[PDB]
Ligand binder design. Structure first.
Ligand SMILES: *[C@@H]1O[C@H](CO)[C@@H](O[C@@H]2O[C@H](CO)[C@@H](O[C@@H]3O[C@H](CO)[C@@H](O)[C@H](O)[C@@H]3O)[C@H](O)[C@H]2NC(C)=O)[C@H](O)[C@H]1NC(C)=O
Ligand SMILES: *[C@@H]1O[C@H](CO)[C@@H](O[C@@H]2O[C@H](CO)[C@@H](O)[C@H](O)[C@H]2NC(C)=O)[C@H](O)[C@H]1NC(C)=O
Ligand SMILES: *[C@@H]1O[C@H](CO)[C@@H](O[C@@H]2O[C@H](CO)[C@@H](O)[C@H](O)[C@H]2NC(C)=O)[C@H](O)[C@H]1NC(C)=O
Ligand SMILES: *[C@@H]1O[C@H](CO)[C@@H](O[C@@H]2O[C@H](CO)[C@@H](O)[C@H](O)[C@H]2NC(C)=O)[C@H](O)[C@H]1NC(C)=O
Ligand SMILES: *[C@@H]1O[C@H](CO)[C@@H](O[C@@H]2O[C@H](CO)[C@@H](O)[C@H](O)[C@H]2NC(C)=O)[C@H](O)[C@H]1NC(C)=O
Ligand SMILES: *[C@@H]1O[C@H](CO)[C@@H](O[C@@H]2O[C@H](CO)[C@@H](O)[C@H](O)[C@H]2NC(C)=O)[C@H](O)[C@H]1NC(C)=O
Ligand SMILES: *[C@@H]1O[C@H](CO)[C@@H](O[C@@H]2O[C@H](CO)[C@@H](O)[C@H](O)[C@H]2NC(C)=O)[C@H](O)[C@H]1NC(C)=O
Ligand SMILES: *[C@@H]1O[C@H](CO)[C@@H](O[C@@H]2O[C@H](CO)[C@@H](O)[C@H](O)[C@H]2NC(C)=O)[C@H](O)[C@H]1NC(C)=O
Ligand SMILES: *[C@@H]1O[C@H](CO)[C@@H](O[C@@H]2O[C@H](CO)[C@@H](O)[C@H](O)[C@H]2NC(C)=O)[C@H](O)[C@H]1NC(C)=O
Ligand SMILES: *[C@@H]1O[C@H](CO)[C@@H](O[C@@H]2O[C@H](CO)[C@@H](O)[C@H](O)[C@H]2NC(C)=O)[C@H](O)[C@H]1NC(C)=O
Ligand SMILES: *[C@@H]1O[C@H](CO)[C@@H](O)[C@H](O)[C@H]1NC(C)=O
Ligand SMILES: *[C@@H]1O[C@H](CO)[C@@H](O)[C@H](O)[C@H]1NC(C)=O
Lengths: 108, 156, 190, 121, 156, 190, 156, 190, 121, 108, 121, 108
């Protein structure tokens, strides 16, 4: 199977700082099918960066996915008090059909 | 439906062992091949023209590379769709799933033998798009042929 | 498997090694060796830091009138050399036709896409595709953009004749097909 | 665009009830549906998926394979999940998503519903 | 009807504010866009291919005009229907109503949103023709929709 | 308004100024000044009775090998000069590349369509259409016929650069697209 | 269906006495002519464009050969289907029945005036093929038009 | 006769001798004589087997700068010369432009499709088809194959001007339509 | 080709009757119809016009707008003119003509009917 | 509105002489939609020229329309006894839909 | 592919019986089928030939033209030959063949039936 | 009418030797429509060559049709004991529709 490993597990950064997440897959992954979702408590997961580099609708400039064909990073231009939540990396294809990471928490 | 060949399956073309990578024999019905006569938007039909030309040239003309190359630059280029060639080059430069002309996929009816026009199996990152990556694209193709055969079946 | 019950999914993959006699072929071996072949005659394109030709000459006055002269291969070399943007600098291209075809493209910088390297790599991009020597859009951020031209770290580009001995998995005649569209499309007034 | 949740409740192991996400406001038959859940204290996990149009291909996670059943009805724009023989491990909040798999569009889940609660004890 | 775009209206293309001259949003359904992705007889479709290419080129490649021009000459000309380009030049030289590819007209269904393939608005003597100059042509196009939509309505 | 009750008539007009960065543009202002632009780099095409260059010199041996040399604009000039019917006489074409692109066509007779003026106006006709410099069929009777070549009363046609500052209304790349077909279509054996 | 001509048979095109070899007047209905104004897979349609362009050029432009030849190479050459032109050259080099663009055969309805798209009368060994040499091919066209006319007749 | 009872078989044959004013024409009277014409101006292509021009000179510097110079015909000659595969040797092509257009191709060997004769006959093959001067596949057995190039037993090929006098049955413009796509297609680097 | 006139007569002001030009010998539903009249001692003037096929667009001269009605029925191949609330100025001879408005050919009226006389006093 | 002015009002020329008419419009007029008609007594109007330069069917070589925009003409190569009638010019488009001239009369 | 023969026998001059070659295993309506006989001591000779997709065109040899009749029925996939007024010269063995006449294929008879014996005296 | 003349009438060659037949037509004949058939007693006629040079299915390499547009031939690479039968030449078109030769016999 394919496992998506998210490092570091948690981030403790002050508002206005710049953050960089990371998603790692066991196999070699087609970057066309890598998406990032922001999950914030009551709110349903919110798509941010589909295609590993393209922002979704109504996504600020801050969210900007990146990464080569093996490493899948997500960075924040200047993290704000409104974007403290759980960040997931997702892959489509392989086994299982939809692969989700263990999650990464960003806290003050 | 009139048929077109530069050489010698009833009503359609058929593919020999030495022109298919991993199959002894695979070929298609009359309806699908007839489309490649009129249509020029499918990368599969460019294979049919190149396969057909190569079969005819090998049987009728003795081997020679200087004169076969010069006839290719002058004459045979018109058998390749010019818009398709440059489109897939643009899809390559932007790193989106493009067609490198090798593998094609199609649907075959279980009994009647009706066969869709094969569509290219796209590649990216040096890897073919995996069978489930265009699953919803296959579903509409199956529904496209349901109407196409039902229209002919009802009118009899 | 089976779609809608009464249709099934299957695939056909063409083997293009049997087209070798009638139409040409274009390939890249690893990342730096590339081969264009017609029948059994072929060409070797190598991206190296090693210089083979040192003399400052690319002369064809005597090359055409020699005891041996491959017309099939000289057709390909002429087609490729005429797909380079603008005018090729003879201060940067050396040739040697004593025994076989051997042309050296210097490609030393002496701004990323406006140099002689960027023009030569445009000829490479059309014939051999964009599989190698390119960086995709989404590698340096979601707003980072890639250059127009393919870029290389190597210095020299060598084209030499080489008998075809199955160095590749045949790709078809589309590499040379795209070259003929771009031949002398941007050739300068001179 | 909107997916509307439905179903949910509390039930002991042995019997189960189906979920429903009757999406409306868009072309239902043109998109493939998904089911996603999140166990309390655990991250997001995939549950099921059914393709567009006829829905011939239905994919399940190996953990819940054999007792879950994902189905859809494009006639009236409703998505189901028939659960059988629920277990205390299945207690979680369940989501319904929307996705389309083709060449033009990269893979993503775009329009989600709201949580559906399922307690098993 | 499969639809492809080099860049990223469900099932069809949509036009942005900065590419439409005097409107905020005008764009078309799935049925009409598919015809431009299969045929090359309509002059409107050559515009969509140019708009689509320009949008993708700007987002993925940094600005550079020396290299954008060269890729235009070698590659992008294939996205323009050559026969249509030479025809309108012939209609221009003979002083008959021709098209410089700027203004197009179409019919939009009041309820269903169905939209015809836009047809060029023709210019002669340095002036656009009024709608009354080709009124009978519009009446003919409206009947094409009626048969085309009723064909799908009966079969359901 | 409304056709057949359930359809309505509406029009779409494309603003072609946003296609400025990727694909070229060719348009005319007022029958005397014509503009070809790529991105922000443009060209001045003026029909004048005023002569700018007096010397009989057009050498590109040294112009190409200079630090100041626009590759984008020199591509257009080379394309336009190669679409001229027959062979252009260097007795009638003068050049100046000291302070940018500047070339001169005499177009002076010193029979109407068989002259150097008619050949040059054929290049102008393809790139810029037939909006100007043409007479329609029926101006001189119901059986009066018009020459193929576009005719002008001016003598000199000058080409110089300009920096694009909205001299004109954008027309699209179709003008330069038609030039590509006609480039060297009627060259002579030489 | 809209029909265009460079020049000015209601709804279609008609052929003149000094324009056909051995006939005072032959021409075709609206249905068949429209296909040539939208498609390019038939060789008969390349004749119509050359015929139509020549008629307009003679009436509007005074005679001149060096200017008419240049416009043919640069502009008018694009009116000839390149794939069809360079396929029949391949069929001529292989000594198989090809078309030299002279004689075309078609079926015309006895009463309604309905007319098929004319197909070329192929030649080989310097001799035309007898009508019996492709009799079954003619039988395809007859049954094609039964369905085509029954399609429009039933729908009303 | 009548098919299905309500359709009748009929044929149309185009008299394309009226396309002579606008589009050119390429004919072949018999094996030795072939004709290319535009309007009333024409060319004489004779596979004569005896020489007409003996001097070893082909210069076009003087020919262009003469009062007598046909632009229509010299366009045709320049189109045919650049359709010859490879590069034409001036050791084998003699020219004379004192009165009209006359150029001589030597076509003597001094192994059959690789000669100068095979290249010239490739230009002949495209313009005039394979109606004459070719041997079909099934003449020397059911497994006997034919050469790629058309073969001639003659020695010289002369091109001369000739006012049109209905020397053939008009063939249409397709003769030179294929020539335009052959022009400089296989040109060498030079 | 031929347009056959009909109608005609004299009526006092207020009373009115319709005109008719039942053309035959060609395809009626493709061509657009017009109405032209000529007052005594006066030149030709345009009256009405109805487009082809469904006749969605009907155009009138401002002089006779509001009381002149133009209509056609392609089924019977006939063109009418329901002209009401007559006036002494309306006394003239009326014509029916034929025209097609497309890009293919210029605009003209080529096939005309014969005179129809109308007297109002 | 658009008004078509035909000058001169009347013509009196001997048989076998050229007769040049005129048709002036207050607007800028597309030459493609200008037609001339001959109206003679009981005969219905007969189309002579359409598109300002194209002779209709069964029109002798004598009739010849001409003229650019805003300045239209009509000339008779050699007027015969049967071509004495009222000559009209029209335009299609603008206001009204069809605009007719006042009429030019040709007599002996 | 297989053509199955039928009919046959002997009959005195004056009356005759039809022949049948009910081919099966392929598409009947696409192929044109012929009749070939061979008199004892004589070579092969052509008898009749009917085209396909309706059998509009039927050609007979002038030796037997007028009394023979070739017909086909694409519904039941069978080819007939209605002989009338047989003559002692017609004693021979008769064959049925299959052919297709188009641009793609050359002319040749491909699949034959077996011998059918006809005796008349 | 067209007549197909086959010469010589009878062949008597030893096994393992080349046998060359000939078919002659009165008129000029398109080589595309010329076929050869082998007829062996009880067996139905068996197609050997069509198009005058194309071997059919199941036809050994020995059989080889040839001939120009006037004189037709048929050769046997090395005749075997089982290829002794009657060889016919055929032509489609002209009068009658199907033309057959008189037949050439090959014997020991
Ligand atoms: C040449 O074409 C380019 C691109 O087609 C034009 O530049 C683009 O102009 C648009 C609209 O003026 C710019 O969009 C603007 O973006 C900013 C934020 O980025 C926002 O404040 C504005 O409301 C508007 O949306 C766009 O950024 C700009 N550049 C690109 C790369 O698209 C340019 O105007 C054209 N020049 C001429 C002389 O026609
Ligand atoms: C380049 O790709 C080619 C595959 O054809 C390989 O080059 C060969 O490498 C082997 C082992 O090093 C040598 O024995 C051969 O001589 C090489 N070929 C030639 C033509 O020199 C290899 O995979 C790649 N070579 C690199 C990366 O240096
Ligand atoms: C490729 O180009 C480089 C740089 O243009 C050449 O190296 C230079 O040669 C010149 C010749 O005068 C010297 O002045 C420079 O010092 C050299 N080095 C550099 C870094 O510029 C090089 O010679 C060329 N290649 C070959 C094979 O000659
Ligand atoms: C050929 O030479 C070039 C430079 O002369 C090498 O490119 C360097 O690659 C390294 C990778 O370790 C980079 O860190 C350097 O920055 C590159 N150089 C420059 C100037 O950018 C290239 O790797 C050499 N290749 C071989 C096979 O020797
Ligand atoms: C490139 O071609 C040249 C010449 O065709 C080859 O060099 C010849 O190789 C043969 C081997 O059979 C020698 O006998 C000759 O002496 C060589 N020279 C000439 C002038 O013929 C060369 O081998 C080819 N390159 C490769 C890589 O095979
Ligand atoms: C045409 O091109 C030339 C060459 O670029 C321009 O001349 C230069 O203009 C700049 C202005 O920034 C001056 O600083 C330079 O001294 C000029 N000369 C050179 C050799 O660079 C010229 O300006 C261009 N024409 C116009 C109208 O801008
Ligand atoms: C441009 O103009 C003419 C075109 O031939 C030439 O100069 C003329 O030469 C003739 C004959 O020698 C004289 O009658 C004229 O007076 C000359 N000048 C002009 C302005 O016509 C020459 O090719 C060019 N001359 C210049 C000054 O640029
Ligand atoms: C440029 O010069 C030419 C001729 O040298 C001028 O063309 C003349 O235009 C007038 C307009 O009234 C005509 O009457 C003349 O017949 C034309 N000359 C010839 C020789 O035919 C042209 O107008 C001049 N333009 C400018 C701006 O000075
Ligand atoms: C080929 O063209 C040349 C030049 O046009 C013709 O030779 C001229 O013929 C005319 C007859 O009108 C003579 O008066 C001239 O003296 C000839 N020479 C020149 C230089 O003009 C020649 O006749 C043409 N060839 C044929 C076969 O018609
Ligand atoms: C055409 O070419 C032939 C062969 O190249 C020429 O005849 C040869 O001339 C050379 C010149 O030295 C002699 O060495 C040969 O002996 C000649 N004969 C042969 C058979 O090669 C001939 O002269 C050329 N024709 C013309 C008109 O110049
Ligand atoms: C297409 O790309 C795949 C992926 O590497 C490769 O295996 C295949 O050979 C390629 N096809 C061709 C025709 O080059
Ligand atoms: C097309 O021509 C008309 C003529 O006036 C003009 O108004 C319009 O702007 C032209 N379009 C373009 C894109 O130049």
């Amino acid at each position: 199977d394919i496992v998506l490993t998210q490092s570091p597990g948690t981030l403790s950064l002050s508002p206005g700082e710049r953050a960089t997440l990371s998603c790692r897959a066991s196999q070699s992954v087609i970057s066309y099918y890598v998406a990032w979702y922001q999950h914030k408590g009551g709110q349903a997961p919110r798509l941010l960066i589909y295609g590993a580099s393209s922002r979704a609708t109504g996504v600020p400039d801050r969210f900007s996915g990146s990464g080569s064909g093996t490493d899948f990073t997500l960075t924040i231009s200047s993290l704000e008090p409104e974007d403290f939540a759980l960040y997931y990396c997702q892959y489509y294809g392989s086994s299982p059909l939809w692969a989700f990471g263990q999650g990464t928490k960003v806290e003050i | 439906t009139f048929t077109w060949t530069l050489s010698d399956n009833p009503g359609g073309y058929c593919l020999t062992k030495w022109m298919i990578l991993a199959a002894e024999l695979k070929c298609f019905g009359n309806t699908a091949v007839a489309k490649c006569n009129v249509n020029h938007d499918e990368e599969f039909c460019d294979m049919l023209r190149l396969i057909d030309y190569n079969k005819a040239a090998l049987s009728k003309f003795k081997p020679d590379v200087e004169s076969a190359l010069h006839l290719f630059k002058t004459t045979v280029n018109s058998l390749i769709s010019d818009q398709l060639l440059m489109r897939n080059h643009l899809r390559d430069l932007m790193c989106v799933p493009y067609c490198n002309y090798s593998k094609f996929w199609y649907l075959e009816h279980a009994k009647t033998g009706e066969t869709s026009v094969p569509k290219c199996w796209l590649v990216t990152n040096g890897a073919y798009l995996n069978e489930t990556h265009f699953s919803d694209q296959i579903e509409q193709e199956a529904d496209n042929m349901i109407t196409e055969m039902l229209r002919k079946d009802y009118i009899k | 498997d089976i779609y809608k019950g009464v249709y099934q999914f299957k695939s056909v993959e063409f083997d293009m090694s049997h087209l070798n006699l009638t139409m040409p072929n274009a390939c890249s071996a690893n990342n730096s060796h590339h081969y264009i072949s017609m029948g059994t005659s072929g060409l070797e394109l190598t991206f190296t830091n090693d210089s083979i030709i040192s003399h400052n000459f690319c002369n064809l006055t005597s090359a055409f009138n020699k005891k041996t002269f491959d017309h099939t291969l000289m057709s390909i070399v002429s087609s490729l050399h005429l797909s380079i943007r603008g005018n090729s600098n003879y201060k940067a291209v050396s040739c040697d036709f004593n025994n076989g075809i051997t042309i050296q493209y210097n490609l030393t910088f002496s701004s990323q896409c406006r140099t002689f390297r960027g023009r030569v790599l445009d000829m490479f991009r059309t014939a051999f595709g964009g599989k190698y020597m390119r960086s995709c859009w989404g590698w340096t951020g979601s707003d980072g953009k890639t250059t127009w031209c393919s870029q290389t770290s190597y210095q020299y580009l060598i084209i030499q004749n080489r008998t075809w001995e199955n160095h590749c998995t045949y790709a078809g005649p589309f590499g040379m097909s795209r070259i003929l569209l771009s031949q002398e499309k941007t050739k300068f007034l001179t | 665009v909107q997916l509307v949740q439905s179903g949910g409740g509390l039930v002991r192991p042995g019997g189960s009830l189906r979920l429903s996400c009757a999406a409306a406001g868009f072309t239902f038959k043109r998109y493939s549906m998904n089911w996603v859940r999140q166990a309390p204290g655990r991250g997001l996990e995939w549950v099921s998926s059914i393709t567009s149009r006829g829905g011939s291909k239905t994919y399940y996670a190996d953990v819940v394979k054999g007792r879950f059943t994902v189905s859809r009805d494009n006639a009236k724009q409703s998505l189901y999940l028939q659960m059988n023989s629920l277990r205390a491990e299945d207690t979680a909040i369940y989501f319904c998503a929307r996705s389309l798999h083709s060449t033009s569009q990269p893979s993503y889940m775009d329009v989600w519903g709201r949580k559906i609660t399922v307690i098993v004890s």
